[PDB]
Amino acid sequence: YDIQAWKKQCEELLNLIFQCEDSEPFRQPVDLLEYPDYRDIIDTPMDFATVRETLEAGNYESPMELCKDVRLIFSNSKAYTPSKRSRIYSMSLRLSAFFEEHISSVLSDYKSALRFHKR
Ligand SMILES: CS(=O)(=O)Cc1nc2ccccc2[nH]1
Numbered sequence: 491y492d493i494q495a496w497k498k499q500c501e502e503l504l505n506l507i508f509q510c511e512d513s514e515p516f517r518q519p520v521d522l523l524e525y526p527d528y529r530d531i532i533d534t535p536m537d538f539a540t541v542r543e544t545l546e547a548g549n550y551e552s553p554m555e556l557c558k559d560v561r562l563i564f565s566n567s568k569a570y571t572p573s574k575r576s577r578i579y580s581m582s583l584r585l586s587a588f589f590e591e592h593i594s595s596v597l598s599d600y601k602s603a604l605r606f607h608k609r
Pocket residue numbers: 515516519520521525566567568570571572576577578579
């Protein structure tokens with residue numbers, strides 16, 4: 491029932507994600523010199539350094555907000571991919587499975603702690 495525990499749990503999950511070779515394309519904002527049409531396709535770019543910085547700045551109120559930004563990294567990858575077989579898209583699918591597997595308990599514990607707080 492610790493309402494704040496999600497933050498360190500998210501920091502540790504982001505550390506695991508940065509160690510994972512599948513996060514390489516997503517560790518920093520997309521470079522427009524490499525992908526000049528990126529903003530024609532993607533409304534809201536997102537990457538793991540921006541997620542980490544937002545968390546460390548105290549700019550996420552809940553793990554649901556962090557989850558929404560991480561899911562945006564994966565939906566941007568799916569929207570930009572030229573094919574379902576691309577290297578970077580295949581990396582985002584594995585990384586998404588890894589993220590969803592680990593964020594589930596974080597979200598559950600936070601929501602349970604908040605329901606207890608407001609009982
Ligand atoms: C900096 S990035 O994340 O590699 C930009 C991007 N996102 C993609 C998704 C699929 C294929 C190529 C893609 N290039």
